[PDB]
Structures are given as structure tokens and as C-alpha cells.
């Protein structure tokens, strides 16, 4: 019987792919606690206990750290898209820094027997050293770890001296993507079936009705929405109204009006978990998160990755999708009618999506992975 | 791979002990949906998808329906404590009635492969018949099922004709209480380790501090409080005032001002999940729900059951706690200093509580139970 600690640093997509593992551990009878520094209420709403290890976290202070430690990062590495996380070390370090004091304090109080952390959260690894216990890493997308944690730690040495901690290696790394979506393996890389989680939902007095014609979903994460705004979507909706398919627009629960008068074959829909919405869908157009890519795979439908041109974090997803052939890649500004027509019509996309789905289902479930983890330690 | 439907009828204690099973199924890769008729938001806050199968549910329309089907009930059976759930058939039927149309509709749309329902939710069993699939029952306390479902169904004949359904037997019944707390077995009764669930929480910037002195938890549930009122607890606190020990008063989210000044050895505390609170407690005084009894066992501490004298559903819990010796029984009006002193000092209570805890922990976890259920079907 164990006390297990889940560590998630701030950033899009970081939290949710930990939930199934946290529940897996709880339903196996272990004590489970999550440490986060944003969206603590979101972790609670998955029925979990959460400690906010940095109530004073500030994206502005994160950038001041970077300006201090690498004055030229902003006008160099940051202007082009991430292809390797280690080169973003100075910044990931800046993100991890404000979490350190509180995480160390938490590890002292809670005395975890194990630490599970998301990839971008080196603090997870230092937490595991402070406790002297095994750490298990959780990957959200196609990003290879390589030397990122050493790079990151190099920018946190004052903090590592203060807490007398050193940098260990995780005993296992759990991928989100199936083998054929990855070209290079992680050290001690473990594969795990993706089980979509998007938050709980009161769906209504019934299940969402099955639509007259099976629809194409155009969806945008409420956090990806804040940054780029509604500007991105117009050119996609405009494209859609020139296509032989019915489209459904899932922009969360945002005011749909300032877009304008929606094309007759595009209908807006209130928020539901993505996986709920896709059971009635034939394809999906989205921003390009690894979570979504996988949730689309779970639906066995083809997809189109169309992030805004200014998203610096969409590369690794794109290559995976292109190379394996489960979908199409473009940018939000570049989407046209012909591309959407190809999404619905190019059968080789569906064949692949279905083939990968079959590949992913054969992989260990969260429940089985918990079991494998316990045995390994 | 299966679609699994969870059915919970209105009533204190009905929903929560389904959560661990729902999570267990989801983490094993299955589709999971909860059907409720009250507190749909609570089920969502455990990260699940919920359908409200009776948006117009009314405790008042319920009371009227029994006042029609059995006018003598309201002043006979309802005035003395349930010793037998079957005797309450007319009312349990009334409670299930408004859920039938919606649940039948849901089963047609969702096509579940398996139904899991809490004990007082006969509709679960009719839903399983509609689908032609196995049902598994979940018990929350010591109540024996015996002939309750047949008695309940006998009041729902018009609705069974309408939906062309018959009443099946569950293929298994999952107990909340461990063997030595039970005198009589369910047919195909299975035992399962209790893993406390009270809802997620943002605990703060740290874990609740370990207190100066070890404390006796005086607790009462938020919904339990809406029924009985906050005055039902003055006496217990007054008593505590006169005991050379320390108490922590935990009354959910409730405004606590109506109790006025508290004795210097009783301290109020904001809401956390029960299991979190009891980590540092040495004993617990509570209203007597089966969930709470089991959460106290999981803490391995002795307990005192002090329900309001007007709680008609207290009996089965009482006998289990008395007979096994894991705690003391009284009513809220009757609690005195000497009884509290006994709670803290009678070592035989701790020995038994610890003994039962060891018995419970050796039972199958919810993860292992899911696995047993799938094998059985």
C-alpha cells in the first residue's frame, strides 16, 4: 500500500493525461495526491485531492527568469517552433522554478512512496530524489526527452543546493502515442492505451442525439482559444460552407455571435467532452494537441491538424500525423475547401486511422499499467 | 470492450459508493455513463459523464404517490425505524417511478453491455432487462436485499407493461461491509475493499497541518445536515466540552454561527474529504451512514454512531457496530461525557476496529473487482 504523488507543471495538455493513472492507483487502493500550480479546481473536478504548490505562479515572472538567464532566448529559440525540448531548457526551468519550494515542502509532509510526473516537470524528478523514491514519467505527445532534464536542472542549481537534491532518472516513461507514431524510443519506454479524459459532464436529460448526417467536428481548446482568439476560425468556417458535409463547431461554451452569421451547414454545439462529441463524427479539424490526436485516434476517424501559424509547439504532432498517414497537416490560415474535401474523401486516411486505433487498443490499459508499475518497484 | 451503465436512485449515500467502480471500469478501457436524478453535478465532479434521467424529480410528488398507493404507510411504517427494506417497497417504488421513462430511453440510446446499480435502485434491474444484459448490485451498508425488488416491482406494474420488461436477478452483489460486520449473506455476495471517496478537493498550498494534540473527529455530512438541522449536534458538542480530550468539529460547507461559542477544546475546521480529516484523528463521532462506518474502519479508529432520534434508516448500521465491537451506539440526544470517555478509553474498540481494518484490506480492490466482474460475464 502506497502514497503516490502526481506532479504536473503549468502548460497546455500537462494535467489531463495524468488522471487515468491517478484513478488507476486509487482504485488499486493506494493514496493519491496531485501537485499542480494552475487549474487546481480542474484536478479536484476529477474527484482527486490537490495541493497547489505555487499559489504565486506568474507567467510574467517566468519570462523575467528567462530574460535573466538567457537574454537572447526570446529573439532566437523562441521565434521558431520547438523541435527539441532540451533547447527550451532555460524556459522549462523557469516554469519549474516557482514550484520547487512548495513541492519540496509537500514531499516532506506527504512522504510519497512514488512520484509520477508529466514530462515538462523536472520538479517531479527532484521531488522523487528528496523522498529517495522511484519516479515514473508521463509523455503527452511525440516529444523525445533526451537530455532535457539535465539542461533544465543546470538552470536550477541554486535551488538544488538549497534542498540538497540531485537529478535522478525515471524508472519508466509512459508514452501517449503508439509505436508506429514514434520513430525514436524513450529509455524504458512503456506504451499505454489512451483513454480520453476531458473532464466530467452533465450531458442533459438524454445522450446527444445522433445527427441527420454524420458530422465533421471543428474544435478548439478553451485555453488555445484565449491566446489566438476567434480570428483563426473564420477562414475555417468559410472553407466549411463550401463543402459537401455537415460540420459541427465545438468552441467550448464561448459566445459564438462575434463570428458572424454561420454557414448553413455548420452548426454550433455546447460543450461536451471531446470523446463524447466524436462518437457521432466522421472526421475532426483541430489545433493539434497530442491529447486530441489520440482522442481522434480513439474515435477511429481521420483528422486535420490546423494550428494557428503562431503556435510554436505543434511540430512533433504534425510529423507523426503526416508520416503515418492518419491525417492531414496545415495551418489555420491555409485551410481551404479542397483540403477539407480531401479529409472526408481520401480513404487512405480512414484506413490508417482505423489501423492505428487497432494498434492502440491492443496496448496495456491504465489499470494494467498501474499493475506493471507496482511490479517494477 | 464494453459500454457500462451506472444507475443511482435519489437518497443519502446512494451515489458515492459507485464512483470507485466507475473509475475502475474506465481505467480498464470501457465506456462509462452514470444515470442519476439528483446531484448530477456531484457525479460530474468525479470526472464522469452523467445523464439526468428525471429532471422533474420531486420528493413531494413522491410523498403523494405513496399517500395514494398506501395511505396507511405515512403514519405506520414511516413512523418507526426501517428494520427491513422490503417493508419500504411502496416508497422505494415511488422513488424509482419517475426515473423509469428516462432510464428506458437511455438504455435504448446507449445500448449498455452491463448495468451496475445501487441497492435501492430497482430501475437499474429493469434497465438491465430492457437491454437483455447482466446486472451487478452495489450495497452501501448492512441492509439485506431479500425480496425487496419483487415488492418494489409489484408497485411498478403499469410501467413494466409499458416497457415490456421483467425483473431479473443481479449476477452479483458487491458488499460495502466486510464479512464480520454481516450476519447474513446476500445471494452471490462478493466482498470489496472500501476505498473512501468524498469528492475532490483543493486542500490549499499544503497538506492540512498535523495538530498539536490528537483529536476526536465530530463529523456530520452536508446533506445529512440539510435534513436534520444543525441543532441536532449541540448536545454532542456540549458533552465534548466536559471531556478532558480534544475534538475537531467538521460540519461540511455549513455556516457554523448558529452553534454560537464553542468549548475551548473543540475546534471548527473547513470541509475536506472525511478520509483526509481522519488521518490525524483518534476516534470519530458521526451520524451513522454505512460509508462513514467504513471510512472510519479504513482509518482503523473506534467510532460512535449518534444519529438523530428521528432518523429511520439507522438500524442495520447500529447492530453491525455493536455486535462486532468496532464502536458504540447511541442517539444524538443521549450522548454524554461518560460515553465519549468510553470511546477514547475502551481499548477493545480500537483492537476490533484495527482487526476489521486488517480483514477489509485483505479483500479485493475495486480494480481487482472490475476484473472479476468482466470474467464472470
B262 neighbors B237 (Cβ within 8 angstroms): yes
Which chain B residues are Cβ-neighbours of A48 within 8 angstroms? 200
Judged by DSSP in three states, A34 sits in: strand
Phi and psi (nearest 5°) for B189?
A: -85, 125
Q: Do B46 and A44 touch (CB under 8 A)?
A: no
Binding site: residue ranges of B?
222, 271-272, 274, 287, 291-292
B72 neighbors B62 (Cβ within 8 angstroms): no
Of B182, B199, B146, B164, which is closest to residue B17 (Cα–Cα)?
B199
| Window A:86-145, CB contacts with B under 8 Å | 102, 105-106, 109-110
Residue corresponding to grid cell 451496475: B116
Q: Which three cell numbers stand for residue B325?
A: 465491537
Query: Cα Rg for chain A, rounded, in angstroms?
Result: 21
Is A183 part of the contact surface with chain B (CB cutoff 8 Å)?
no
Q: How far is CA A31 from CA A112, B144, B196, in A?
A: 9, 31, 10
Is B2 part of the contact surface with chain A (CB cutoff 8 Å)?
no
Judged by DSSP in three states, A303 sits in: strand
Dmax over CA atoms of chain B, in Å, equals 64
Binding site for dTDP: residue ranges of B?
222, 271-272, 274, 287, 291-292
From the centroid of its chain, how far is CA B319?
A: 16
Q: Do A202 and B41 touch (CB under 8 A)?
A: yes
Give the Cα separation of A256 and A269 in Å (integer): 10
Resolution (A): 2.8
The architecture that CATH gives domain A204-361 is 3-Layer(aba) Sandwich (3.40)
Give the angle A241-A247-A251 at the CA atoms, nearest 5°.
105
Of B237, B243, B298, B304, which is closest to residue B273 (Cα–Cα)?
B298
A286 neighbors A306 (Cβ within 8 angstroms): yes
Q: Which three cell numbers stand for residue A160?
A: 538544488
Give the angle B185-B113-A45 at the CA atoms, nearest 5°.
85
State the sign of the Cα–Cα–Cα–Cα dihedral A325, A326, A330, A335.
Answer: positive
Which chain A residues are Cβ-neighbours of B373 within 8 angstroms? none
Rounded to the nearest angstrom, the minimum Cα separation between B192 and chain A is 11
A75 burial level (CB within 10 Å; 0-12, 13-18, 19+):
exposed
Which residue among B44, B105, B106 sits closest to A200, beta carbon to beta carbon? B44
Which residue among B19, B45, B52 sits closest to A205, beta carbon to beta carbon? B52
Phi-psi map region of A250: left, alpha, beta (phi>0 left; psi -120 to 50 alpha): beta
Residue of A nearest to B43 (CA): A200
**Method of structure determination:** X-ray
Parse chain B into domains and list their residue ranges: 1-203+362-377, 204-361
Which chain B residues are Cβ-neighbours of A43 within 8 angstroms? 200, 202
Of B187, B177, B182, which is closest to residue B140 (Cα–Cα)?
B177
Q: In 10 A of CB A183, how many CB atoms?
A: 11
From the centroid of its chain, how far is CA A123?
A: 18
Judged by DSSP in three states, B222 sits in: helix
Q: Do A28 and B109 touch (CB under 8 A)?
A: no
Q: What is the DSSP letter of A46?
A: B
Chosen for mutation from B3, B4, B26, B278 (greatest number of chain A CBs closer than 10 Å) is B26
Give the Cα separation of B20 and A35 in Å (integer): 21
Q: Are strands A114-118 and B215-219 parallel, antiparallel or unpaired?
A: unpaired
Binding site for dTDP: residue ranges of A?
222, 271-272, 274, 287, 291-292
Rounded to the nearest angstrom, the minimum Cα separation between A46 and chain B is 4
Give the Cα separation of B264 and B135 in Å (integer): 52
Judged by DSSP in three states, B278 sits in: helix
From the centroid of its chain, how far is CA A10?
A: 11
| Window A:239-278, CB contacts with B under 8 Å | 273, 276
Give the Cα separation of A41 and A26 in Å (integer): 19
Chosen for mutation from B38, B277, B367 (greatest number of chain A CBs closer than 10 Å) is B367
Q: How far is CA B297 from CA A289, B182, B292, B302, in A?
A: 44, 14, 8, 8
Q: Do B202 and A41 touch (CB under 8 A)?
A: yes
Q: In 10 A of CB B377, how many CB atoms?
A: 12
Phi and psi (nearest 5°) for A216?
A: -105, 125
B136 neighbors B366 (Cβ within 8 angstroms): no
Residue of A nearest to B23 (CA): A23
Is B35 part of the contact surface with chain A (CB cutoff 8 Å)?
no
Helices (H), chain B: 16-27, 40-44, 59-69, 89-96, 100-110, 122-131, 148-153, 157-162, 222-228, 234-240, 274-278, 290-298, 315-324, 337-345, 347-361, 366-376
B327 neighbors B349 (Cβ within 8 angstroms): yes
Give the Cα separation of B90 and B86 in Å (integer): 9
Give the Cα separation of B140 and B177 in Å (integer): 8
What is the DSSP track for A136-174?
A: EEE--SS---TTHHHHHHHT-HHHHHHTT------SEEE
Give the Cα separation of A273 and B21 in Å (integer): 21
Give the Cα separation of A319 and A329 in Å (integer): 9
A149 burial level (CB within 10 Å; 0-12, 13-18, 19+):
buried
Burial B74-112 (b: 16+ CB within 10 A, else e): eeebbeeebebbbbbbbbbbbbbbbbbebbbbbbeebeb
Bridge partners of residue A176, in order along the sequence = none
Of B208, B183, B207, B179, which is closest to residue B194 (Cα–Cα)?
B179
Q: Do A206 and B1 touch (CB under 8 A)?
A: no
Q: Do A202 and B276 touch (CB under 8 A)?
A: no
Query: Cα Rg for chain B, rounded, in angstroms?
Result: 21
Any residues with CB less than 8 A from the CB of A368 and at least 6 apart, and which? none
Give the Cα separation of A46 and A32 in Å (integer): 12
Residue corresponding to grid cell 417497497: B89
Q: Do B24 and A27 touch (CB under 8 A)?
A: yes
Give the Cα separation of B94 and B66 in Å (integer): 6
Give the Cα separation of B297 and B142 in Å (integer): 14
Chosen for mutation from B202, B209, B280 (greatest number of chain A CBs closer than 10 Å) is B202
Find the Cα–Cα–Cα–Cα dihedral A368, B4, B147, B64, rounded to 10°. Answer: 140
A31 neighbors A3 (Cβ within 8 angstroms): yes
Q: Do A109 and B27 touch (CB under 8 A)?
A: no
Give the Cα separation of A4 and A9 in Å (integer): 17
Rounded to the nearest angstrom, the minimum Cα separation between B310 and chain A is 32
A190 neighbors A173 (Cβ within 8 angstroms): yes
Is B220 part of the contact surface with chain A (CB cutoff 8 Å)?
no
Phi and psi (nearest 5°) for B137?
A: -95, 145
Phi and psi (nearest 5°) for B312?
A: -75, 0
Dmax over CA atoms of chain A, in Å, equals 63
Q: In what order do the strands lie in the sheet with A114-118?
A: A189-191, A172-175, A135-138, A114-118, A3-7, A31-36, A49-52, B201-204
Q: Do A202 and B50 touch (CB under 8 A)?
A: yes
Two domains, one topology: B1-203+362-377 and B204-361 = yes
B125 neighbors B149 (Cβ within 8 angstroms): yes
Helices (H), A132-288: 148-154, 157-162, 222-228, 234-240, 274-277
Rounded to the nearest angstrom, the minimum Cα separation between A281 and chain B is 16
Q: How far is CA B56 from CA B53, B96, B101, B296, in A?
A: 9, 13, 12, 36
Which residue among A27, A207, A273 sits closest to B367, beta carbon to beta carbon? A27
3-state secondary structure B159-208: HHHHCCCCCCCCCEEEECCCHHHCCCCCCCEEECCCCCCCCCEEEECCCC
Task: Tell me which long-range contacts A370-373 makes (C-beta under 8 A, separation of at least 24).
Answer: A370/A21, A370/A24, A370/A25, A370/A28, A370/B27, A370/B367, A371/A28, A371/B367, A372/A190, A373/A114, A373/A136, A373/A172
How many CB pairs below 8 A link A and B?
146
Give the Cα separation of A297 and A274 in Å (integer): 12
Give the angle A374-A117-A140 at the CA atoms, nearest 5°.
105
Residue ranges with strand state E in chain A: 3-7, 31-36, 49-52, 114-118, 135-138, 172-175, 189-191, 201-204, 215-219, 246-250, 266-268, 281-286, 303-305, 327-329
Q: Which CATH code for domain A1-203+362-377?
A: 3.40.50.2000
Q: How many residues does chain B have?
A: 377
Amino acid at each position: 500500500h502506497m502514497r503516490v504523488l502526481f506532479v504536473s507543471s503549468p502548460g497546455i495538455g500537462h494535467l489531463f493525461p495524468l488522471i487515468q493513472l491517478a484513478w488507476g492507483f486509487r482504485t488499486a487502493g493506494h493514496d493519491v495526491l496531485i501537485a499542480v500550480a494552475e487549474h487546481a479546481d480542474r484536478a479536484a473536478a476529477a474527484g482527486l485531492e490537490v495541493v497547489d504548490v505555487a499559489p504565486d505562479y506568474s507567467a510574467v515572472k517566468v519570462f523575467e527568469q528567462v530574460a535573466k538567464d538567457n537574454p537572447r532566448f526570446a529573439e532566437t529559440v523562441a521565434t521558431r517552433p520547438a523541435i527539441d525540448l532540451e533547447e527550451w531548457g532555460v524556459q522549462i526551468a523557469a516554469v519549474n522554478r516557482p514550484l520547487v519550494d512548495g513541492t519540496m515542502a509537500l514531499v516532506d509532509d506527504y512522504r510519497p512512496d512514488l512520484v509520477v510526473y508529466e514530462q515538462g516537470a523536472t520538479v517531479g524528478l527532484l521531488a522523487a530524489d528528496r523522498a529517495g523514491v522511484p519516479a515514473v514519467q508521463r509523455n503527452q505527445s511525440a516529444w523525445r526527452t533526451r537530455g532535457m532534464h539535465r539542461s533544465i536542472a543546470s538552470f536550477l542549481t541554486d535551488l538544488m543546493d538549497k534542498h540538497q537534491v540531485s537529478l535522478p532518472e525515471p524508472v519508466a516513461t509512459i508514452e501517449s502515442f503508439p509505436p508506429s507514431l514514434l520513430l525514436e524510443a524513450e529509455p524504458e519506454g512503456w506504451f499505454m492505451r489512451w483513454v480520453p479524459y476531458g473532464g466530467g459532464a452533465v450531458l442533459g436529460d438524454r445522450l446527444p442525439p445522433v445527427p441527420a448526417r454524420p458530422e465533421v467536428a471543428i474544435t478548439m481548446g478553451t485555453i488555445e482559444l484565449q491566446a489566438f482568439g476567434i480570428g483563426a476560425v473564420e477562414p475555417i468556417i468559410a472553407a466549411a460552407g463550401e463543402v459537401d458535409a455537415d460540420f459541427v463547431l465545438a468552441l467550448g461554451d464561448l459566445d459564438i455571435s462575434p463570428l458572424g452569421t454561420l454557414p448553413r451547414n455548420v452548426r454550433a454545439v455546447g460543450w461536451t467532452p471531446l470523446h463524447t462529441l466524436l462518437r457521432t463524427c466522421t472526421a475532426v479539424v483541430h489545433h493539434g494537441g497530442g491529447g486530441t490526436v489520440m482522442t481522434a485516434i480513439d474515435a477511429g476517424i481521420p483528422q486535420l491538424l490546423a494550428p494557428d501559424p503562431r503556435d510554436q509547439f505543434q511540430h512533433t504532432a504534425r510529423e507523426a500525423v503526416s508520416r503515418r498517414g492518419i491525417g492531414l497537416v496545415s495551418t489555420s490560415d491555409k485551410v481551404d475547401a479542397d483540403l477539407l474535401r480531401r479529409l472526408i474523401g481520401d480513404e487512405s486516411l480512414r484506413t490508417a486511422a482505423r489501423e492505428v486505433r487497432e494498434e492502440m487498443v491492443a496496448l496495456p490499459t491504465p489499470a494494467e499499467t498501474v499493475r506493471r508499475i507496482v511490479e517494477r518497484i
